[PDB]
Design a protein around this ligand. Structure first.
Ligand SMILES: O=C(O)[C@@H](O)[C@@H]1CCCN(c2ncnc3[nH]c4cc(F)ccc4c23)C1
Length: 167
């Protein structure tokens, strides 16, 4: 039993809710919140910009130190950093950004990072400003992630769609 509330169950291990991940996160304090990061951990907009804003820019300060030490992530890769006031940990995962021409096959590799964590609150990778089809993204998520994932979808219209077209 865990503290996540109001989700619809898609599979044994995938759940989904119309929610703001920032507000979903501040209430649950999940062990892991996933950020839809870029390779530079520059959290300017989308989920990343919102999450970072909710940390009063502490996420960005920590991220800049990480990059200064380690260099950029790989597309499809991830790193674990602090969750600040939102979660114990933040798993920064780089999905491919279609608006940069990145290969969509890397979306499966991106979701594989979720399997290193027993339970996660997460957005749909490569959705939103990253330009992928959130329905394809949901399919890859369901077919790749084996751990327990709670998907927060900000847009009510999108959500209702994803549900109605799910197989
Ligand atoms: O649409 C984008 O560009 C992306 O970021 C994707 C797709 C939809 C939005 N996004 C989220 N997914 C789940 N919760 C969210 N809360 C937010 C608050 C914001 F100010 C901006 C985006 C989100 C957000 C992931």
């Amino acid at each position: 039993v865990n503290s996540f509330s109001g989700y619809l169950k898609l599979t044994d291990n995938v759940y989904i809710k119309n929610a703001d991940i920032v507000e979903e996160a501040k209430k649950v304090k999940p062990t892991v919140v996933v950020n839809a990061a870029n390779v530079y951990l520059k959290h300017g907009g989308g989920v990343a910009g919102a999450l970072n804003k909710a940390t009063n820019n502490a996420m960005q300060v920590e991220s800049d130190d990480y990059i200064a030490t380690n260099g950029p992530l790989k597309v499809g890769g991830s790193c674990v950093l602090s969750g600040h006031n939102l979660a114990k940990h933040c798993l920064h995962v780089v999905g491919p950004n279609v608006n940069k021409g990145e290969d969509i096959q890397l979306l499966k590799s991106a979701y594989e990072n979720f399997n290193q964590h027993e339970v996660l609150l997460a957005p749909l990778l490569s959705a939103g400003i990253f330009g992928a089809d959130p329905i394809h993204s949901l399919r890859v998520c369901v077919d790749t992630v084996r751990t327990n994932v709670y998907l927060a979808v900000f847009d009510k219209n999108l959500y209702d769609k994803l549900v109605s077209s799910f197989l």
